[PDB]
Amino acid sequence: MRLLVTGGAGFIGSHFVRQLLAGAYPDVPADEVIVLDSLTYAGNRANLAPVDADPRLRFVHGDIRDAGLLARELRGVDAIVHFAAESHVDRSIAGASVFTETNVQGTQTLLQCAVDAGVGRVVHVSTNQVYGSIDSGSWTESSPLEPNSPYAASKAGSDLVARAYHRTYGLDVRITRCCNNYGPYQHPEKLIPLFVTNLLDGGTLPLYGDGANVREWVHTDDHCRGIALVLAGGRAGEIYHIGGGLELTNRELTGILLDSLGADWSSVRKVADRKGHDLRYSLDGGKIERELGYRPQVSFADGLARTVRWYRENRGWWEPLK
Amino acid sequence: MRLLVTGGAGFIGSHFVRQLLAGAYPDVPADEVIVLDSLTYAGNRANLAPVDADPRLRFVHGDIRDAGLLARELRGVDAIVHFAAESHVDRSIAGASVFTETNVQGTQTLLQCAVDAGVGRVVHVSTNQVYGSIDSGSWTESSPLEPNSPYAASKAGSDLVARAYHRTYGLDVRITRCCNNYGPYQHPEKLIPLFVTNLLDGGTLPLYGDGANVREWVHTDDHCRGIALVLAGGRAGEIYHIGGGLELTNRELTGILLDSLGADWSSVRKVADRKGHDLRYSLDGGKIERELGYRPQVSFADGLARTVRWYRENRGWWEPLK
Ligand SMILES: NC(=O)c1ccc[n+]([C@@H]2O[C@H](COP(=O)([O-])OP(=O)(O)OC[C@H]3O[C@@H](n4cnc5c(N)ncnc54)[C@H](O)[C@@H]3O)[C@@H](O)[C@H]2O)c1
Ligand SMILES: NC(=O)c1ccc[n+]([C@@H]2O[C@H](COP(=O)([O-])OP(=O)(O)OC[C@H]3O[C@@H](n4cnc5c(N)ncnc54)[C@H](O)[C@@H]3O)[C@@H](O)[C@H]2O)c1
Ligand SMILES: Cc1cn([C@H]2C[C@H](O)[C@@H](COP(=O)(O)OP(=O)(O)O[C@H]3O[C@H](CO)[C@@H](O)[C@H](O)[C@H]3O)O2)c(=O)[nH]c1=O
Ligand SMILES: Cc1cn([C@H]2C[C@H](O)[C@@H](COP(=O)(O)OP(=O)(O)O[C@H]3O[C@H](CO)[C@@H](O)[C@H](O)[C@H]3O)O2)c(=O)[nH]c1=O
């Protein structure tokens, strides 16, 4: 079983690789694991340090946009788990082009090379942001694509490329959509690590707009497990939501973070709101529960405590990133 | 070290604050920075957006003419950097009164409150226009005050108030005089931003009179650094010229601007000359060089390229101002 994981040196991808190599996914035979990652500002070899010497791992410093490389690296690969992408909304508003280049064009190159290489199946990792914003209720897999940021539209375009590969060429590609993830090794440009590390440095927390925005949080371990279940038992062309359950306003979350670190509101700063900021995300995960048996297993309280502790203990890791 | 910067939401003042907070002036201890700005048509909170959440910054929306406010805000302040003023010659010709009110009366109120508050030192930001026009040669700090516009006479009157505060009350006030500044965040009523943004909008450039007027240009970063050197090491009551070196006719500069944007002379329009338009400005900066070590470090070609690019990339900022 040869598996290729793109974006495996990033936050979620590295967790997937680590778990896999650790044997957390018995149903996912992985005798050979190739990680393909271009090492952008978000890719970090340290994320794979724990599995560095594993004889089953091959690390490829390269790009999904590189057709030649792929045509070689995908030879005899049975499956691909695709996490490689530009992932930050803020960066997408500031410089949008890279998002279409990596997310849409990169996905197309990858999927065409998969077809050319006879790859058996692909799990295309996506996000709940393709659905825009939802005032009340939760989105299901049939919800409309109404992305509001360049990042979200790039992911949605990638999802559409995946569909077309399945419909035109018969490629067995499965799509997952998940809510905000959190956990160790998340880059500090993201909300939780940013705020936790800012407090660790005795700094302020830049709370966008009024902090009323709502996000659903899932520990990355749960997301990864959902992906492994889709990889092992999903169906060609299907979309699967992987949720975490827990919905919080950014204000609520900030309070929780402050509490966790013994800090107070005085460390918060109201800053201009993000342009086109999505008010609320909420996913319905009944499909994957009923069809594949997935449900989040890490409680926010526990997961969060552990994450904060991780940041406390790994300044050497995050400091250089800030 | 508590510092109060008036006019800190304007063009130059915001750059000074940003640089300071960024650590560009190691010799200027700034544990606490208060910015006092009345937010006239020229003051813009967006100019301080990048430093908004900095715990060392306190933004005070208020006026230098407000004695009561000052008497409170100057408590325990060690130094003041005074940039607040009405800065456009054209506006001064159209409605002169505000120039005496803000520039002269505002300075007097500020300096008297400084005395009442025991403020250690003040850097009064002034201009080369107090010297009138110079056909050949450059002005030194002993050059005569021969202002020709209501704006220039208001600045010169403010400089005289500063001298009197130093001579009568012992206030340690240092005066700086500089040439035309340019750079990001300059309000588009000024020559460069006006012409660059007009070209960006596909409009014409209103070239006053024959365009033969000569101006000396300095990037604001250099000016700010000169101010920081005077603040840290100048001497009470002294005047210091901060120059940029580069002298150009407005016609020459227009050509440079056109070139930079791929436009041509056809976009220019000869319009009536400004009343009492000063023919040429030229400052000698040997004093500050020999006494404080200052010399401009940003070459016009580089500085300008970057400025134009800034305007290209920040329509959202300037558009609302036009
Ligand atoms: N972070 C979340 O909360 C979340 C929620 C849902 C979905 N997702 C999706 O999960 C995936 C992983 O996100 P993440 O948070 O781990 O992202 P990340 O920003 O932590 O990491 C992205 C990784 O992809 C690599 N990469 C970027 N462009 C590349 C290219 N052209 N070729 C090869 N490698 C490239 C980077 O070097 C990096 O290691 C993304 O597709 C993202 O859209 C993320
Ligand atoms: N722009 C230049 O090329 C240049 C060259 C030499 C000297 N100067 C001097 O430098 C200083 C800064 O000029 P600038 O170009 O940044 O000006 P500007 O027009 O960009 O900004 C002036 C700022 O002062 C504030 N202000 C005006 N009146 C006020 C009042 N009564 N109380 C408080 N705040 C008030 C405004 O809100 C604004 O933020 C001025 O004193 C100007 O005379 C400018
Ligand atoms: C970075 C930052 C963020 N925020 C707010 C904006 C959002 O409402 C919320 C979370 O911000 P971010 O960490 O940037 O995450 P968000 O935009 O929700 O998107 C995340 O979750 C998405 C799934 O919802 C993933 O697809 C994205 O890749 C991932 O980055 O916190 C602040 O208030 N201040 C900040 O400094
Ligand atoms: C706005 C404008 C200006 N001009 C000319 C007039 C001047 O000769 C030259 C620069 O004009 P302004 O941008 O208004 O700048 P100027 O009067 O030289 O004064 C600037 O530099 C001064 C220092 O010299 C500062 O004290 C002033 O605050 C600052 O505004 O360009 C035009 O030909 N057309 C225009 O539309």
PDB file of N, CA and C and ligand atoms in Angstrom, chain A residues 7 9-13 36-43 62-64 83-87 102 125-127 151 155 178-181 186 190 223, ligand 1:
ATOM      1  N   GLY A   7       0.952  18.209   1.178  1.00  0.00           N
ATOM      2  CA  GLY A   7       0.794  19.141   2.274  1.00  0.00           C
ATOM      3  C   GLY A   7       1.031  18.487   3.623  1.00  0.00           C
ATOM      4  N   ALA A   9       3.569  18.475   5.480  1.00  0.00           N
ATOM      5  CA  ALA A   9       4.418  19.135   6.437  1.00  0.00           C
ATOM      6  C   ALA A   9       3.692  20.324   7.043  1.00  0.00           C
ATOM      7  N   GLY A  10       2.390  20.413   6.738  1.00  0.00           N
ATOM      8  CA  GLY A  10       1.553  21.492   7.278  1.00  0.00           C
ATOM      9  C   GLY A  10       0.908  21.068   8.594  1.00  0.00           C
ATOM     10  N   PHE A  11      -0.018  21.871   9.090  1.00  0.00           N
ATOM     11  CA  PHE A  11      -0.682  21.569  10.329  1.00  0.00           C
ATOM     12  C   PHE A  11      -1.454  20.260  10.335  1.00  0.00           C
ATOM     13  N   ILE A  12      -2.539  20.215   9.580  1.00  0.00           N
ATOM     14  CA  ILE A  12      -3.364  18.989   9.594  1.00  0.00           C
ATOM     15  C   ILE A  12      -2.686  17.765   8.957  1.00  0.00           C
ATOM     16  N   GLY A  13      -2.019  18.019   7.804  1.00  0.00           N
ATOM     17  CA  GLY A  13      -1.390  16.942   7.075  1.00  0.00           C
ATOM     18  C   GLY A  13      -0.353  16.227   7.906  1.00  0.00           C
ATOM     19  N   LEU A  36       4.378  14.904   0.076  1.00  0.00           N
ATOM     20  CA  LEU A  36       4.803  15.899  -0.943  1.00  0.00           C
ATOM     21  C   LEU A  36       4.423  17.290  -0.400  1.00  0.00           C
ATOM     22  N   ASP A  37       5.448  18.134  -0.179  1.00  0.00           N
ATOM     23  CA  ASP A  37       5.148  19.437   0.411  1.00  0.00           C
ATOM     24  C   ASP A  37       6.179  20.418  -0.095  1.00  0.00           C
ATOM     25  N   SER A  38       5.713  21.602  -0.541  1.00  0.00           N
ATOM     26  CA  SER A  38       6.570  22.589  -1.093  1.00  0.00           C
ATOM     27  C   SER A  38       7.252  23.455  -0.051  1.00  0.00           C
ATOM     28  N   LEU A  39       6.912  23.254   1.212  1.00  0.00           N
ATOM     29  CA  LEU A  39       7.547  24.053   2.233  1.00  0.00           C
ATOM     30  C   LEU A  39       7.382  25.543   2.053  1.00  0.00           C
ATOM     31  N   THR A  40       6.133  25.989   2.007  1.00  0.00           N
ATOM     32  CA  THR A  40       5.845  27.413   1.955  1.00  0.00           C
ATOM     33  C   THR A  40       6.056  27.930   3.396  1.00  0.00           C
ATOM     34  N   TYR A  41       5.651  29.160   3.668  1.00  0.00           N
ATOM     35  CA  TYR A  41       5.783  29.724   5.005  1.00  0.00           C
ATOM     36  C   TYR A  41       5.081  28.861   6.029  1.00  0.00           C
ATOM     37  N   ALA A  42       4.132  28.038   5.558  1.00  0.00           N
ATOM     38  CA  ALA A  42       3.331  27.188   6.426  1.00  0.00           C
ATOM     39  C   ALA A  42       3.861  25.759   6.559  1.00  0.00           C
ATOM     40  N   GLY A  43       4.755  25.341   5.653  1.00  0.00           N
ATOM     41  CA  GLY A  43       5.255  23.950   5.739  1.00  0.00           C
ATOM     42  C   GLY A  43       6.433  23.893   6.703  1.00  0.00           C
ATOM     43  N   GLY A  62       8.644  19.354  -2.800  1.00  0.00           N
ATOM     44  CA  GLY A  62       8.229  19.658  -4.161  1.00  0.00           C
ATOM     45  C   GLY A  62       6.801  20.157  -4.181  1.00  0.00           C
ATOM     46  N   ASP A  63       6.362  20.541  -5.377  1.00  0.00           N
ATOM     47  CA  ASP A  63       5.090  21.191  -5.547  1.00  0.00           C
ATOM     48  C   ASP A  63       4.023  20.408  -6.276  1.00  0.00           C
ATOM     49  N   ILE A  64       2.769  20.592  -5.851  1.00  0.00           N
ATOM     50  CA  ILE A  64       1.681  19.897  -6.543  1.00  0.00           C
ATOM     51  C   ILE A  64       1.465  20.404  -7.985  1.00  0.00           C
ATOM     52  N   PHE A  83      -3.856  17.558   1.171  1.00  0.00           N
ATOM     53  CA  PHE A  83      -4.070  18.633   2.093  1.00  0.00           C
ATOM     54  C   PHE A  83      -3.387  19.869   1.614  1.00  0.00           C
ATOM     55  N   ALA A  84      -2.438  19.734   0.645  1.00  0.00           N
ATOM     56  CA  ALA A  84      -1.695  20.913   0.207  1.00  0.00           C
ATOM     57  C   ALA A  84      -2.612  22.049  -0.266  1.00  0.00           C
ATOM     58  N   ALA A  85      -2.416  23.262   0.270  1.00  0.00           N
ATOM     59  CA  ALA A  85      -3.194  24.422  -0.092  1.00  0.00           C
ATOM     60  C   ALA A  85      -2.667  25.650   0.629  1.00  0.00           C
ATOM     61  N   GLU A  86      -3.089  26.815   0.117  1.00  0.00           N
ATOM     62  CA  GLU A  86      -2.896  28.111   0.792  1.00  0.00           C
ATOM     63  C   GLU A  86      -4.152  28.136   1.705  1.00  0.00           C
ATOM     64  N   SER A  87      -4.014  28.191   3.070  1.00  0.00           N
ATOM     65  CA  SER A  87      -5.155  28.052   3.994  1.00  0.00           C
ATOM     66  C   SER A  87      -5.680  29.245   4.810  1.00  0.00           C
ATOM     67  N   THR A 102      -2.416  27.831  -6.162  1.00  0.00           N
ATOM     68  CA  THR A 102      -2.201  26.593  -5.436  1.00  0.00           C
ATOM     69  C   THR A 102      -3.447  25.730  -5.276  1.00  0.00           C
ATOM     70  N   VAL A 125      -9.266  17.219   0.516  1.00  0.00           N
ATOM     71  CA  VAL A 125      -9.548  17.878   1.761  1.00  0.00           C
ATOM     72  C   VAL A 125     -10.003  19.300   1.557  1.00  0.00           C
ATOM     73  N   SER A 126     -11.258  19.536   1.963  1.00  0.00           N
ATOM     74  CA  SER A 126     -11.911  20.781   1.819  1.00  0.00           C
ATOM     75  C   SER A 126     -12.502  21.373   3.112  1.00  0.00           C
ATOM     76  N   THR A 127     -13.224  22.499   2.947  1.00  0.00           N
ATOM     77  CA  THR A 127     -13.684  23.258   4.080  1.00  0.00           C
ATOM     78  C   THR A 127     -15.139  23.675   4.037  1.00  0.00           C
ATOM     79  N   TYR A 151     -10.080  32.837  -0.494  1.00  0.00           N
ATOM     80  CA  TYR A 151      -9.702  31.522  -0.044  1.00  0.00           C
ATOM     81  C   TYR A 151     -10.862  30.573  -0.225  1.00  0.00           C
ATOM     82  N   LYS A 155     -11.061  27.118  -2.666  1.00  0.00           N
ATOM     83  CA  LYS A 155     -11.333  25.773  -2.242  1.00  0.00           C
ATOM     84  C   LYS A 155     -12.552  25.199  -2.996  1.00  0.00           C
ATOM     85  N   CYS A 178     -14.650  20.318   6.428  1.00  0.00           N
ATOM     86  CA  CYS A 178     -14.594  20.358   7.862  1.00  0.00           C
ATOM     87  C   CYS A 178     -14.622  21.788   8.365  1.00  0.00           C
ATOM     88  N   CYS A 179     -14.896  21.875   9.671  1.00  0.00           N
ATOM     89  CA  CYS A 179     -14.933  23.172  10.370  1.00  0.00           C
ATOM     90  C   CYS A 179     -13.554  23.589  10.845  1.00  0.00           C
ATOM     91  N   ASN A 180     -13.457  24.674  11.631  1.00  0.00           N
ATOM     92  CA  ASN A 180     -12.137  25.075  12.128  1.00  0.00           C
ATOM     93  C   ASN A 180     -11.466  24.032  12.974  1.00  0.00           C
ATOM     94  N   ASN A 181     -10.239  23.722  12.572  1.00  0.00           N
ATOM     95  CA  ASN A 181      -9.484  22.780  13.375  1.00  0.00           C
ATOM     96  C   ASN A 181      -8.572  23.523  14.372  1.00  0.00           C
ATOM     97  N   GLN A 186      -0.313  23.970  14.959  1.00  0.00           N
ATOM     98  CA  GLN A 186      -1.030  24.868  14.061  1.00  0.00           C
ATOM     99  C   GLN A 186      -0.193  26.164  13.952  1.00  0.00           C
ATOM    100  N   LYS A 190      -3.016  31.668  12.821  1.00  0.00           N
ATOM    101  CA  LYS A 190      -4.418  31.273  13.094  1.00  0.00           C
ATOM    102  C   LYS A 190      -4.867  31.712  14.504  1.00  0.00           C
ATOM    103  N   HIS A 223     -10.602  15.359  13.024  1.00  0.00           N
ATOM    104  CA  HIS A 223     -10.695  15.572  11.595  1.00  0.00           C
ATOM    105  C   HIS A 223      -9.925  14.492  10.828  1.00  0.00           C
TER     106      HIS A 223
HETATM  107  N1  LIG C   1      -6.997  24.673   9.212  1.00  0.00           N
HETATM  108  C1  LIG C   1      -8.328  24.382   9.246  1.00  0.00           C
HETATM  109  O1  LIG C   1      -9.037  24.674  10.220  1.00  0.00           O
HETATM  110  C2  LIG C   1      -9.022  23.684   8.129  1.00  0.00           C
HETATM  111  C3  LIG C   1     -10.466  23.355   8.201  1.00  0.00           C
HETATM  112  C4  LIG C   1     -10.927  22.705   6.960  1.00  0.00           C
HETATM  113  C5  LIG C   1     -10.174  22.449   5.900  1.00  0.00           C
HETATM  114  N2  LIG C   1      -8.805  22.748   5.848  1.00  0.00           N
HETATM  115  C6  LIG C   1      -8.001  22.316   4.703  1.00  0.00           C
HETATM  116  O2  LIG C   1      -7.081  21.337   5.157  1.00  0.00           O
HETATM  117  C7  LIG C   1      -5.856  21.437   4.404  1.00  0.00           C
HETATM  118  C8  LIG C   1      -4.720  21.563   5.372  1.00  0.00           C
HETATM  119  O3  LIG C   1      -4.832  22.849   6.032  1.00  0.00           O
HETATM  120  P1  LIG C   1      -3.759  23.251   7.162  1.00  0.00           P
HETATM  121  O4  LIG C   1      -4.527  24.141   8.157  1.00  0.00           O
HETATM  122  O5  LIG C   1      -2.954  22.092   7.614  1.00  0.00           O
HETATM  123  O6  LIG C   1      -2.876  24.241   6.244  1.00  0.00           O
HETATM  124  P2  LIG C   1      -1.451  24.843   6.546  1.00  0.00           P
HETATM  125  O7  LIG C   1      -1.460  26.273   6.088  1.00  0.00           O
HETATM  126  O8  LIG C   1      -1.083  24.425   7.973  1.00  0.00           O
HETATM  127  O9  LIG C   1      -0.453  23.987   5.646  1.00  0.00           O
HETATM  128  C9  LIG C   1      -0.523  23.977   4.196  1.00  0.00           C
HETATM  129  C10 LIG C   1       0.567  23.010   3.766  1.00  0.00           C
HETATM  130  O10 LIG C   1       0.537  22.820   2.333  1.00  0.00           O
HETATM  131  C11 LIG C   1       1.845  23.000   1.782  1.00  0.00           C
HETATM  132  N3  LIG C   1       1.690  23.610   0.449  1.00  0.00           N
HETATM  133  C12 LIG C   1       1.176  24.843   0.141  1.00  0.00           C
HETATM  134  N4  LIG C   1       1.149  25.053  -1.185  1.00  0.00           N
HETATM  135  C13 LIG C   1       1.756  23.911  -1.743  1.00  0.00           C
HETATM  136  C14 LIG C   1       2.018  23.533  -3.096  1.00  0.00           C
HETATM  137  N5  LIG C   1       1.761  24.317  -4.162  1.00  0.00           N
HETATM  138  N6  LIG C   1       2.551  22.277  -3.273  1.00  0.00           N
HETATM  139  C15 LIG C   1       2.816  21.493  -2.188  1.00  0.00           C
HETATM  140  N7  LIG C   1       2.642  21.760  -0.921  1.00  0.00           N
HETATM  141  C16 LIG C   1       2.085  23.002  -0.761  1.00  0.00           C
HETATM  142  C17 LIG C   1       2.500  24.003   2.722  1.00  0.00           C
HETATM  143  O11 LIG C   1       3.941  23.987   2.624  1.00  0.00           O
HETATM  144  C18 LIG C   1       1.975  23.496   4.081  1.00  0.00           C
HETATM  145  O12 LIG C   1       2.755  22.450   4.679  1.00  0.00           O
HETATM  146  C19 LIG C   1      -6.066  22.606   3.416  1.00  0.00           C
HETATM  147  O13 LIG C   1      -6.523  22.122   2.124  1.00  0.00           O
HETATM  148  C20 LIG C   1      -7.183  23.434   4.086  1.00  0.00           C
HETATM  149  O14 LIG C   1      -7.904  24.169   3.061  1.00  0.00           O
HETATM  150  C21 LIG C   1      -8.264  23.378   6.915  1.00  0.00           C
END
